[PDB]
Point group: C6
Chain length 157, copies 6
């Protein structure tokens, strides 16, 4: 998987798809909307989980989403439910909105709570091993990250 370099709105998640650890690319695109209510298109992910993430970004991090068309896409055609994808969704969207990309060597694991906190998920060890195997060198996960704001200060400030 050889992907777009330095385009904002891209974030790698160390996911569990079914029973298998996979590193996947979460993509997001944000744009000033013409319509009265902003478009919210989600493909390959749980739209509801995404809404929660979008709400946290807007309310807890002050991202100006309410007039922004937001598209979120899991590259590669899979459909994945994993709560561990939240972090990557949160950061892809943030990256897409402020227009600066994430490092290419970073992989992301975590549940996102309505308070903006990052929460433990199943299979952290497997997820991390697979990220190592796939060649990543920096990791944000619930072991080393507690609040979403910290990850933003660290990579998207």
């Amino acid at each position: 998987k050889e992907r777009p370099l330095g385009v904002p709105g891209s974030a790698v998640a160390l996911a569990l798809a079914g029973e298998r650890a996979l590193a996947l690319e979460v993509q997001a695109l944000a744009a000033k909307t013409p319509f009265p209510a902003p478009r919210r298109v989600v493909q390959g992910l749980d739209g509801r989980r995404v809404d929660v993430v979008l709400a946290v970004l807007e309310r807890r991090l002050g991202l100006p989403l309410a007039n922004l068309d937001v598209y979120v896409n899991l590259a590669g055609g899979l459909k994945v439910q994993d709560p561990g994808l939240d972090l990557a969704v949160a950061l892809a969207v943030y990256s897409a909105v402020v227009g600066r990309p994430l490092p290419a060597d970073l992989a992301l694991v975590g549940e996102v709570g309505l308070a903006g906190e990052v929460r433990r998920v199943a299979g952290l060890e497997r997820r991390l091993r697979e990220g190592e195997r796939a060649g990543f060198g920096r990791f944000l996960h619930p072991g080393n990250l507690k609040r979403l704001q910290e990850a933003v200060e660290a990579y998207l400030a």
Copy 2:
């Protein structure tokens, strides 16, 4: 202790678990406000919110409201109503619940708290998980009492 978070002693399938119910409320930019529900039955959350607005006088009509069951699971369990009601109230009013409190109960349209399956298993799991204080249909009859006792 950020406001808008409440611990329910749930039955998920056959299994008793302490789960975190979360809510966020803020002024809506829109004609009709957003209701988003994750991990919980949307119609039950809808009933609870109507009780909160109409029986308790919580001004939800111009608020965006988001309710989230933390942990990944999707649980339909009437027993979660109490946590949902309290999480929302807390969130709206900016005052948090104690960290050592766990909640169980169905919530009716009159604002009353109703018996649910598996009370003893729920309570045991709360004890085991380290909670010190409990609100359940055995010691609570109405939402109002819970709000008075904890949300000042």
Copy 3:
């Protein structure tokens, strides 16, 4: 099941849930709506059956529903399809709108037709026995009630 005393909008139905006779509490709440179209939330019941009942109340009994938010709820988490629940739905809602409760010793059985009539249902005997067993002393059912208007004159005038 020890329930709210003298709150309007509460009505006991002698239902068939699957194959079993159960006495259940139908609850309704009515409120002056802020929105242009009034909310209609139904939980644990057939929304369509409810609509028919709401239409009969408005058109045949003159209940001023069109600007009223109406919530109807089957207490106890079950989801029940029984047509025999119509009567209780009709009376809960009526009670909730006019703001006077039903007697606590009354149990209700019947289908509601679009003309406002009350119609026979399956398992009347079982339903009634269970109501007796559960301690009720007064019964409206298709054996003793033909029109919805009669039940209203009798308990909610």
Copy 4:
């Protein structure tokens, strides 16, 4: 004999039954009026209403319309179209149908009445149930004839 009620000789699964189709119509408070259907296929009711408005000139565009299959069953049976059409017409125009009349037929977009499965079983069940007069694809070709013969 209140208007807006018609008896269909239906096939529900394999079984012939005489069922009551009911309709209610009244002036709508709204920009677009309510269509509520219970116990019947909503798209078939939709087609029938379009025939009633466009072929027969019934002024349904500003009417609330409710159609109800009495008895609890959900039946999809093209054979019910005739009763539905007549129940609605009756309701709109405030004139009832005789009590001894039973109806069978599919209704096309031209307003015609079309053959259906199981005519003889349907008719036998009508006889047995005590009905005296019948409208079916064997003796009726168009909705208009039915309306002229019974809804004056």
Copy 5:
């Protein structure tokens, strides 16, 4: 099946329902709409396939559909997915809009593409035999028809 004579909006399709060749009547009714957006009711057919056909009629053949209520109905209660029904849907609707009927001896087979072309379908031979058996004498199908416009010039000009 003895059907309405010379009413516009009627078109016979030689369909495959499941595995069986059947001649079926596609009916359409078009009317000047009161609402802002025009009604689109489809019964017994694939609504999406119909939309494509309606789009072709409007965009490629200049039918003034945008303010027209359109109802399309497969007579006889079946629900059929066959792409071979497109032609008949296209011509029923056209017939209903311009208010002139199709000949009663004509049967129709074909897929309709977004360019207005008519495309091959499965089971042409079976379809045609059944049309012959049912007593039709003229046939439009992909063997003898390439563009939708040709069929219109031939029967609905």
Copy 6:
């Protein structure tokens, strides 16, 4: 060679086929324009259109858009994205693609073209079906290149 038509080398289930993807675009009469999709996943078409508008500057916001998978099949296959993107572009801009060209590729939100399952089977089927020229993830990286090479 009418504009708005593109040939994809698809995997439908296990099977490689050359299929025609079609699009039509025209000025919308409405506040918000129509999106109709047939035979393809609507969310994937939605993503592709957003890439076309936001990355490539195609003015889709006031256009009605219809996308059709010719042939009857319903195929979900990320490999179809390229044909969909090109069919739409072509349609909007009134310039057609050569008749001998076949296309394969997933399209990301950055406008890039991504690897898909079964490339060799897809290409073999294209050869066999008589196509002379191919665009696939082995020789194309971005949508822009495809647009420059063929849609002038």
